């Protein structure tokens, strides 16, 4: 499927506004499980429940364990670019 590059803008006091599931220990990609209403992912658009997050800000998430992806994602700030594919 198409790999989309999706922009999200975040203030430091905000979260991304997504929940993630999956990861290497489960044999699946990092997958978006929820978009939270009114938070940056919802406001900015472009992300979809069931999307695999292949990368964020150029950092590859394809073979990351869940907690590793949580760390990387949680450390991104400001103008953030996701690369996602719906699965």
């Amino acid at each position: 499927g198409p790999i989309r590059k999706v922009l999200l803008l975040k203030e430091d006091h905000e979260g991304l506004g997504i929940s993630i599931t999956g990861g290497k220990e489960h044999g699946v990609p990092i997958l978006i499980s929820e978009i939270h209403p009114g938070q940056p992912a919802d406001r900015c658009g472009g992300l979809h429940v069931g999307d695999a997050i292949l990368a964020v800000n150029g950092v590859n998430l394809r073979d990351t364990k869940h907690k590793e992806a949580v760390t990387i994602l949680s450390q991104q700030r400001g103008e953030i670019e996701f690369e996602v594919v719906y699965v």
């Binding site: 979260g15 991304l16 506004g17 997504i18 929940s19 993630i20 599931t21 999956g22 990861g23 489960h26 699946v28 499980s33 929820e34 939270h36 869940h66 907690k67 949580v70 994602l73 949680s74």
Partner: peptide, 7 residues
């Protein structure tokens, strides 16, 4: 069986 984390 999967973890789920809000970010």
């Amino acid at each position: 069986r999967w973890q789920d984390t809000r970010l």
